[PDB]
Assembly symmetry: none
Homo-oligomer: 32 residues x 12
């Protein structure tokens, strides 16, 4: 059978989140 | 069974001269 | 030209530069 | 021979809602 | 008993006024 | 004997009768 | 400046029709 | 001198019927 | 002549049926 | 002795059936 | 007579912390 | 002397013990 399933997640541009001070948090349960 | 197509989710914000203090919280709780 | 259930979400923001610390609270659980 | 489809969602804002200090609470769980 | 169902939803907002503090509260969890 | 076809929807909104401070509160769960 | 008193507000929601996809997408910003 | 107060809000959703999958997306950005 | 500010926001939800996956996507910025 | 600045936000959800399906993505911005 | 600033935010869900399954993401974008 | 400022943020859930894991992510770039 034929099946397609994919996605894309991009979070807006803004005042870059450098280190010390600003911050970016990514949480992904466990790993493959 | 059922067939589906991929999707896309994109947010974009323009800021004059990146810098100090931005904060992003992304949680992807899921399994392949 | 075969098409199935598809979607797309776009959030675009263009404007000078509000104050210190923008903030993204986003959740992408997921399920089989 | 007939296929189904869904809609497209676009939230576009100029002026109101600039970078730095803005707050987006967006929930994108998943699909049943 | 299947038919094509698609559309486009675009929301454009823009208007000089005062102060900042803007807030987006959107729930977009899958579809029925 | 109702048929479904494509369509387009665009909405443009200016100044919110009252100070600034905007607030987008929408629930986009499935469709009727 | 005017004196403001408190009050009590309660809401109860049930679903008839059939089955129930519950969905609460709300924005509770604030008012001057 | 002077004194101020706010109101109280209570929300309750529950009703015998079927399925589940609940989704709550909320924005509560404090306002001065 | 002292500043006074209190509040009370309550969101309660429950429903049998089947499966689970509940989803909370919430943004609670802050205050100045 | 005297009232001051306070708040109160309560979220309560009950879900059985399958293994715990829950996905919480919450952003608590904050202020300097 | 010193000003006091406090808040109370609480999320109650009927589900402990099982194995690969429940998922919680919390981000506090701010500086002491 | 120095004004008082602190808060209370709690994420809690109750049900069946179960085993080792569940998945929680806390992001807070800051230093005393």
């Amino acid at each position: 059978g034929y099946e397609v399933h994919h996605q894309k997640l991009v979070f807006f541009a803004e005042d870059v989140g450098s280190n010390k001070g600003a911050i970016i948090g990514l949480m992904v349960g466990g790993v493959v």
